[PDB]
Write a protein that binds this ligand. Structure first.
Ligand code: SAH
Ligand code: NA
Lengths: 265, 265
C-alpha cells in the first residue's frame, strides 16, 4: 500500500543502492522512466534481471499527465516502485509527484542514489563553491533559450562555479554533447557580448560519471570545443575563481594546461 | 595496484551502492574514515558485517597527514578500498588524495553514492536554485565565525537557496542541532542587522536523510527554533523566494504553514 521513488544511479544497474535493490525486489509492481537522463552503461534488460521484475517504462506524457491514472491506483493495494536514472528528485519535476500521491491517499518514500549533482566532486572543484545551476537547451525553430548565459555571469562575478545540465530528447535519442553546449554558448556570447564565454574561457567536462573510466577534461573552449569526450551523457562546468588545489587537480587529473596552475588572486 | 574511493551513502549500511559493495568485497584491504560525517543509522560493526571485510578506521590526521604511508603502500600490490560517508570527493580535501595516488604510481577509481548535496532534493526545493553552500560552526574563545551569514545573504539576494551543514565533533560524537544553528544565526543577525535571518525567516530542516522515515520540516524560525526535529544529523536550509510548486511541496509534505504560499512566493 505504498509508493517508492527509487534512484538507479549514474551509469549502470549497479549504481542503485543496496537499500533500493532490496526494496525494489519485494515490490509488487515496478515502473520506471528513462527520459530525464541517460544511463550509458546498462539496458532495461540488465536492470530487470538485477531486480527480478518486469519493468514497465513510462513516457514523459504517461508520467506528467497520467501518473495518478497509471501508477497511483496500484499503490493503493500494492507496494509499487518508480525507478529513475540518478536521484529521482534532482533536476526533474518528480518531487511534485509525491503531492499527487498524498492527494490519492498513497504514502510515498524516497530511496536516493548517486546523482550527477554530487558526482561533480570528481572534477576536483570544491562542491560548496558551486552557485546557481542551469540547463543548456536545444534551440527550437526560432526559439533560442539563453538564460543559462546569465547564470554563468552571475556565478562568475561571485567567484562561483556553474554546473550546466545538458539537454536530452530521449524519444529522438538525442543527447547534447559538451561540444554542442559550447557552440551554443559562443553564439549567445556573440549576441550578448558580455565576455562571459569565449575561446579563452576555462571549462570542465565530465562524461559518463559513474563508469569506472569517466572522461574528465579541463581547458580553454578554443581547445576543447572539438575534442571527442566519448559517448553521452555529458555535463559542462564553467569554474569561477579557482583555489590552488582545484587548479592542481584539474592539471594532474583532468589534463588541464599547466598554465592554470598559476591563479590570479 | 588499485585504490577505490567508495561512498557509503547517507544513513545506514544499505546506502552503499551495489557496485560499491561488490568492489569492496573483492578488495584485499579496506580502510574507512568517519570524521567528515557519521552513519547515524548504523554502526562500524554492521558495515563490517555487510562488506565481509575487516575495516581499518583512519583518523583525520591519518588521512590528511599520512594517507601516502598508510593506504597507498598497500595499494601498490593489492586492491584497496577507502570508504567515506556520502559520495567520495565531496569532502573538500578528498579530491587531492587522488593526486597523492597518482604521485605514488597508484591508479584510483571513484565509486559514487548518495550525498546530502543531492538528497536535499527531498525537501521539494529545486536543485538548480541552490547557491554557494556553507557550514555553521560553533563559536569558541574569542572566535565567533559568521561568514555563513554572508553566504546566506548573497544567495537569498539572488533568489537562491542556501544549504547549511551543521557543526560536528566526530570523535566526541556531538552534533549541532538545527535549533542551535538558528539561535546562532539570530545572534549573528543581531550583530550585523542585515535583515537576513530573523524570527520571520522561512527555513527548512532535513534530518536523517537516507532513512526511510526522515524528518522534513519547514516554517518560520519563530515557530521552529524550539521544535524537536529528532535525532541528528540535522541539515538547515534557508530558501530564497519560492516557486509556487516548491511552496506547495513544503506545505503538503513538510507541514509548512499555508502562509508561505503567499508570503514566500
Ligand atoms: N552519468 C552522467 N554523466 C554526465 N552527465 C550526466 C550523468 N547523468 C546525468 N547527467 C547530466 O544531467 C542531465 C540529466 S538531469 C537529471 C539528473 C538526475 N536526476 C541525477 O540525479 O543525476 C543529463 O542530460 C546530463 O547533462
Ligand atoms: Na550546490
Amino acid at each position: 500500500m505504498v509508493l517508492y521513488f527509487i534512484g538507479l544511479g549514474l551509469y549502470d544497474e549497479r549504481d542503485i543502492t543496496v537499500k533500493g535493490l532490496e526494496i525494489a525486489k519485494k515490490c509488487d509492481y515496478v515502473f520506471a522512466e528513462f527520459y530525464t537522463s541517460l544511463m550509458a552503461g546498462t539496458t532495461l534488460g540488465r536492470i530487470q534481471k538485477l531486480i527480478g521484475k518486469e519493468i514497465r517504462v513510462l513516457s514523459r506524457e504517461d508520467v506528467e499527465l497520467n501518473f495518478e491514472n497509471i501508477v497511483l491506483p496500484l499503490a493503493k493495494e500494492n507496494d509499487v516502485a518508480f525507478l529513475t536514472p540518478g536521484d529521482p528528485l534532482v533536476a526533474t519535476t518528480h518531487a511534485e509527484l509525491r503531492i499527487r500521491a498524498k492527494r490519492a491517499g498513497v504514502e510515498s518514500y524516497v530511496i536516493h542514489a548517486p546523482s550527477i549533482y554530487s558526482a561533480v566532486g570528481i572534477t576536483g572543484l570544491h562542491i560548496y563553491k558551486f552557485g546557481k545551476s542551469a540547463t543548456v537547451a536545444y534551440p527550437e525553430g526560432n526559439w533560442f533559450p539563453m538564460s543559462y548565459y546569465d547564470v554563468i555571469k552571475e556565478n562568475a562575478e561571485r567567484g562561483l562555479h556553474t554546473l550546466l545540465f545538458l539537454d536530452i530528447k530521449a524519444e529522438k535519442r538525442m543527447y547534447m554533447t559538451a561540444n554542442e553546449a559550447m557552440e551554443l554558448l559562443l553564439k549567445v556570447e556573440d549576441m550578448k557580448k558580455g565576455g562571459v564565454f569565449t575561446d579563452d574561457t576555462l571549462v570542465v567536462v565530465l562524461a559518463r560519471a559513474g563508469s569506472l573510466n569517466p572522461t574528465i577534461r579541463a581547458g580553454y573552449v578554443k581547445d576543447l570545443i572539438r575534442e571527442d569526450f566519448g559517448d553521452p551523457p555529458h555535463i559542462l562546468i564553467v569554474p569561477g575563481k579557482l583555489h590552488i588545489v582545484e587548479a592542481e587537480y584539474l592539471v594532474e587529473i583532468a589534463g588541464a594546461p599547466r598554465e592554470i596552475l598559476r591563479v590570479n588572486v
